[PDB]
Amino acid sequence: IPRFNFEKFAGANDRLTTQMKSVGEVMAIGRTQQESLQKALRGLEVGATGFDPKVSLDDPEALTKIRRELKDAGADRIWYIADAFRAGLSVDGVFNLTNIDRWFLVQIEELVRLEEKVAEVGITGLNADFLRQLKRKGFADARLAKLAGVREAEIRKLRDQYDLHPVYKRVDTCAAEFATDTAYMYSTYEEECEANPSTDREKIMVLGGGPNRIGQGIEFDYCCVHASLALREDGYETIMVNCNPETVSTDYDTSDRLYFEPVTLEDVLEIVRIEKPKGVIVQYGGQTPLKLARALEAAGVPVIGTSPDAIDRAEDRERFQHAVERLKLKQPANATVTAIEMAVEKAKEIGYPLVVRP
Amino acid sequence: IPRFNFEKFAGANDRLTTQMKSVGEVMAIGRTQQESLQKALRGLEVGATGFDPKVSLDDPEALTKIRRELKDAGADRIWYIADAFRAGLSVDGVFNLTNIDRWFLVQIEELVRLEEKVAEVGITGLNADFLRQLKRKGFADARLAKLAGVREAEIRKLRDQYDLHPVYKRVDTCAAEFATDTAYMYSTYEEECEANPSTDREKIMVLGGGPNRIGQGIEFDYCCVHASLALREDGYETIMVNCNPETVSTDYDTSDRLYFEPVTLEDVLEIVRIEKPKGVIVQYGGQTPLKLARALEAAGVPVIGTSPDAIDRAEDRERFQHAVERLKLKQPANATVTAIEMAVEKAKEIGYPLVVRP
Amino acid sequence: IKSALLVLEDGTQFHGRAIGATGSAVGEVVFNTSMTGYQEILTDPSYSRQIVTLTYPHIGNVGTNDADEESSQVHAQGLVIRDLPLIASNFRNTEDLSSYLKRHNIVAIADIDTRKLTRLLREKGAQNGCIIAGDNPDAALALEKARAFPGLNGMDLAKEVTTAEAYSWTQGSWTLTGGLPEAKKEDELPFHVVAYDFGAKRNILRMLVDRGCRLTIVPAQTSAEDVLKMNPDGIFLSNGPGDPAPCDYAITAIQKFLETDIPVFGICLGHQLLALASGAKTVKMKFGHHGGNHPVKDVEKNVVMITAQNHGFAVDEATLPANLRVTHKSLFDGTLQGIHRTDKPAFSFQGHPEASPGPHDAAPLFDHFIELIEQYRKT
Amino acid sequence: IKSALLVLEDGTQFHGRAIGATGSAVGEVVFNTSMTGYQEILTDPSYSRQIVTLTYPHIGNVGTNDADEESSQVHAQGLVIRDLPLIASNFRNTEDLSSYLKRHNIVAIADIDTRKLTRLLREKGAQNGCIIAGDNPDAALALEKARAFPGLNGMDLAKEVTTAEAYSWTQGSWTLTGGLPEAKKEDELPFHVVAYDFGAKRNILRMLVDRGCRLTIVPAQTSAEDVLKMNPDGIFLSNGPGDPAPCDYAITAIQKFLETDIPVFGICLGHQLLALASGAKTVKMKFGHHGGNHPVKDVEKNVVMITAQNHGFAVDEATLPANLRVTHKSLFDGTLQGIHRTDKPAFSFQGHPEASPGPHDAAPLFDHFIELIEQYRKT
């Protein structure tokens, strides 16, 4: 799945054509197309958890937008396809507009249908059997929590309850015809696990930043690789978690164990669950892994290096100001406004020119 | 199917509710529901030949309009249902909006699908087998002609070629379990014909006005009934063609023979074809039969009473103005304006107040 | 394209489409006027060896469901309809008609002029026929098989569908709310009736149960003796396929019960049997009665009831023995519909008081039976 | 919920969904790495008595079509896949996989951990197994069936799939544009080759015809004498199921041919038979070769070809007679893939030069056959 950055280019034409406009891409592996696709969406780093809706069901105009979005593809098309199915459109209808093979479309419609049942039955209808079937389709805990009206952590606890965890398969070029000594894996909901984690060494896990986008390029990946190379050389068993296909970080040669997965809380926790690393590094992959720190720590993950709290202190405009204050350092005059008329006054205080940060 | 007249009440609420707003109704008989519905459509007298489109395929807002028409039923819903299927909405999506049983909906969908093939294959694709299939589903020659991009008479010719004519079945209250001496018939594309026309008497055909509407009411049907009662009494064999379930015209008692059929050129020609009447009266059913007169004659029907030409003379404002002129009679001053500024002038000529007639 | 063809004895061919199993079917051809109830009809044993034609064009609108099965299987030799709906649309549907047919291995044809077919049978009387559904239906062959059909006249079909071994039935009628109920416990049923199975419709049994009867289903050929031994509060003679005439065993037995004081009630084939055992004569009707809008008058009360009919043979009114009074007649053709023994507690009805499908109008016929029973116990 | 279950001899169970016929299937279980060509695979007679597992998860993406049938029927005893796609999506499709399966009455299961199964087969070697598709499939009983399977080792399956009577083959290969051709005319094909049907794949014949060969397909058990009588330009030995070893009749016959100067070419089973006939031995492999990406070296030319493989037995290279020279070896495991007689106009290939499905890399193997034939005719 390609990664775009149209928001940064307000006045740009955002319809997809023959001239590339994507700034990067994510890759995913699944035992089935549905599983593969869903995993790819949740690793895209756009805030999606799968097929999150774009338009409201009770929007009178909804069909008009959906139609537009389908006929003239934008970056969001994938999501408008599912919205289309939620709105009553048919696979043939969608086909006629998009030209995307029905083989793919039927799979998306089916997922929408399952989402509709989840919404309906609620968390209460999330029985072991059904939950399993949904996981097997690539459904993220977060997506399922949205539909059921719960916290992601609730679905996760529920899986824990049913002992519903993925298994890991390995890439081997030959469809298992030959054995592999390499550890290049992906998760899935199947029977046999081929992870076979070592009990031998001290493990260090490095979290990558998924697809590249403006602000989050190859620079973060370079650091992730260096970490792996250095510690491995140092004698640690290095574990890389990433899903950017363009990078060296996803080259099997770069780490002792590579998990080609979505850099999400769900995905990472499952790996940590069986690897039981000594430490996890979250400061090298850019924003993506950084935004996971606090939840990882919360879940018991052994996060190494500068703490999530220390990170937060800096990243928190208020915690920070306090510290600078404390250190007796210089900072430009600043205020936190709520209302317009508030700003103008405060602005008076602060003095023009001004830096207005959302 | 009910008959409405909302165009006559501009400021009125045109949505269907629990308070009746219809001004009349049409009825149709068919061996199948498809056949039955299409015949009724074509007999409604609103210019439909069946499921004629209401919205453009290539209209960006089409889905939005359709949706609305479905959700909040108006007089045109039935056509909008077909448009919905053409536009890519599924049977379930349509159900959800309209609550009309899927049993009916799938039927309409199949008809659309059939129309799309017709559009694709064109007139060349109209082999006997297919054409016959189409006829069996009640498709009108006019509908097929529009899809095929031909003249209605071309389809009719095509049918004559293939020898593809309808058969007549009779109404008998018992599903053919008992014989009947009454000749209350309806057309259908089947094997066995039950018309059994007389060779015996001179027949007179009377065309009805179809459903009642504002302006074309019971008054026209009363005349139709009297023509039949008089001539029948006079010894002719009286054949009535009408599909208004409310009227005395459609009472088996009123005539010798009753064809409960749409009053259209196609349907009428078929009856004529086999009855070979002595004359046809088109002067008593209102506008309906009147508009058919020319075509009927052209096609060789023995129209009696005032000639279609004669009728046209009167109805054509041009022809008329000459006849008044011809006779040295008085008529209000009139003009035929094309442009605005042409009228303003002409109007100065004519003098206010003015009677603008489209 | 999946062809199917139906050929009648006279050589009349109807070409259409296959909607059931691949294969051939041979039977007497009949027409049924029932606008609803196709499933119950199909599962009616009385239709054994018969090719069923339904006059109502759209057959299958509501799908199928186990509750709508009158027997353990499909008895109809074949099915002839005008149109098979695209979908089944009813909350009770568990399987579409076509799927159902296939599963029961029934040869069925759709898309034929059923009307023409119906008028032919009415006009010229019943005919034997054959339906062939497959890649290249052979007309000649079809004609062959039709022609070769033995015919239902003199055919004892009752022995063919009857139960192998006796059994007990204690199940009541379905309710919208409760569906088909749980079989009652013997101690719950007041009377004990012995039912001869001549290809019995489950609704007859169920409605008997509703009246407080515990049943004992017995094979057709069961001996009066063996029966008497059971100490029945009543004896019931069920409906069934074929000619009632050739069923000597039953006739003989019935005669035996008639010497007793035990109440006897026969429905349809059992009506014919009763009649025969009383010295009456049965005939084969032109086309018979198959539908559910049949008016029948209770001559006694001078009241009409709309009934469910399904018969090819009737009892000759003109040959009735004096001990056999007439209780009901058809308003359609005047044919014999009911009779009661002047001297015994035995009566019968040609139609189907149990309907299924059909108007409930004739249900009270059961009621009389109960009376007889209750009064027989009093003594 | 339509259950299905696969149980191996070792007792390993795979719980899934039934996607084909109801019932049971028993045979040796194998894995095939072919990401495409499933239909061709299923209709391969070499797969008789084998339960086929496909490694690629989505099986049935492009539905099915006649043109994609390698023989009259589906010979695979059963089919095992990870996922049966919601729809078929290809212009060429005429029937979805499930329907087709059901049509050919095949027991097949979907939704199982095909990877687990593959790994098991690769690690522990081939195993016999049983699939049960039904309401409540019995594991125990499946296990017994799998344990009771006699095993392919030493099993003559050729005599089982062969043709009753001999026939003529004159049809060429399919084309995108034209599709399958119309049978050529006998006077259109320069050569006349006699082909032994050990369960021959259509493509093999079609491709021979493309090269100008008019075929006479004979029953496996055909005498060399009966054959020679035909004055063949050449003899071809087809592919087939089971152990080549137990096919005495053919080895013997071939031996005869080898005394002559007629050109002989064998493919697969026929390769094996040719080796046996020359005094070589065959062995049954661990799990064998089944897929379409197998690298095979032409030792003579030092070039590699990606080939189509489907064999459980192989010719031992170490037992090769001096009159047998090695022409090809697998790059995957080093096993024997081709041989030529040093003293006679005879050679064979273990892979499948005709592919279908698979890479076309090996089709030139055919050309060499033709040279032998033209040169034989010169003489």
Ligand SMILES: [Cl-]
């Ligand atoms: Cl731009």
Ligand SMILES: [Cl-]
């Ligand atoms: Cl569930």
Ligand SMILES: [Cl-]
């Ligand atoms: Cl328009």
Ligand SMILES: [Cl-]
């Ligand atoms: Cl066609």
Ligand SMILES: [Cl-]
């Ligand atoms: Cl017909």
Ligand SMILES: [Cl-]
């Ligand atoms: Cl499994």
Ligand SMILES: [K+]
């Ligand atoms: K990237």
Ligand SMILES: [K+]
């Ligand atoms: K009206």
Ligand SMILES: [K+]
């Ligand atoms: K027909």
Ligand SMILES: [K+]
């Ligand atoms: K499973």
